[PDB]
Amino acid sequence: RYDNKFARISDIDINQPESWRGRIFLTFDIDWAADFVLQDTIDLIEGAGVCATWFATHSTPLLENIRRNPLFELGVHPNFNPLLAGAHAEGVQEILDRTLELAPGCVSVRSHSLVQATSILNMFGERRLRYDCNILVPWDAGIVLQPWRHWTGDMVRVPYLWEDDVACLYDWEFDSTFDYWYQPDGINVLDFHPIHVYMNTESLRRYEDSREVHRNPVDLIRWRNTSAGSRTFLQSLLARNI
């Protein structure tokens, strides 16, 4: 149903454009959020009653909440940054295999910091991942987006067009009265972080200033932006589209 606007990444059927065209795919890069922060984001999406895909960074009992919910897909968020940062004892394989232990049998992946390479995608495919979510093409680039077949692993590359922290870096609006990014004729994948939904981030300086409080369940709420930000953007998007 057209009215079923929200979908999971694994609902994309590359052979059937009806499975993605004009639809919205809410995705969440967990990024090591404390449990109270992740729980708040889960509660917000569960309250809307929509589908969503969650990319896991670490082990937490809240992953079981995500697994249970039939509207939610659990994927992985492997962190290969230490490989790029300087000398290291391991490669991609060890890190990927460890991350996959968080969601055995999953099919969707987005790399922390969008770390990607031909060999990385080859290794994703060997491990039976089917959807790569690592290409970010901005909604304002003038490009109508569509997922496409990768040349190996029967993988599908799924490009995404909006991200909360990226919106801060590009100075995109959090308080527009319409879905400026929306493509009725393309795929619409958005990426949110629980930390920014929790603090209603409108500037990364709020995020940086509050660093010491990000895991403090008593004080963090005091840093929530009361103007427009990531949280109010998500809340409006949900209200307008359910």
Q: Name which of Zn ion, its own copies, none residue 31 binds, using a CB cut-off of 5 to 8 Å depending on partner kind.
A: Zn ion
Do residues 192 and 25 lie in contact, with contact meaning Cβ atoms separated by under 8 Å?
A: no
* DSSP classification of residue 15: T
Q: Is 112 in the site for Zn ion (CB under 5 A)?
A: yes
Measured CA to CA, the distance from residue 21 to residue 13 in angstroms comes to: 11
Nearer to Zn ion, 14 or 25 (CB): 25
Instruction: Pick the closer one to Zn ion by CB: 14 or 96.
Output: 96
Partner that binds at residue 180, options Zn ion, its own copies, none, CB closer than 5 to 8 Å by kind: none
Least spacing, CB of residue 112 vs Zn ion, in Å: 4
The angle subtended at Cα 40 by Cα 34 and Cα 58, nearest 5°, is: 35
Query: Which residues lie near its own copies (CB under 8 A)?
Result: 80-81, 83-93, 111, 113-120, 135, 137-138, 140-146, 148, 151-152, 159, 166, 169-170
| Partner from its own copies, Zn ion, none contacting 218, C-beta within 5 to 8 A by type | none
Degrees, nearest 5: CA angle 37-62-43: 55
| Cβ(70)–Cβ(89) below 8 Å | no
Q: Are 174 and 204 in contact (CB under 8 A)?
A: no
Q: Which residue has the tokens 């889960």?
A: 42
Part in contact with Zn ion (CB under 5 A); list of ranges 8-16, 93-101, 107-115, 140-148: 107-115
Residue 31 in the binding site for Zn ion (CB under 5 A): yes
Least distance between its own copies and beta carbon 99 (Å): 15
Q: Which of 29, 73, 164, 165 binds Zn ion (CB under 5 A)?
A: 29
CA gap 134, 118 in Å, rounded: 12
Distance CA 115, CA 215 (A): 26
If we measure between CA atoms, which residue out of 40, 71, 84 comes closest to residue 192?
A: 40
Binds 117: which of its own copies, Zn ion, none (CB < 5-8 Å by kind):
its own copies
- The residues of the shown chain that bind Zn ion, judged by CB under 5 A, are 29, 31, 112
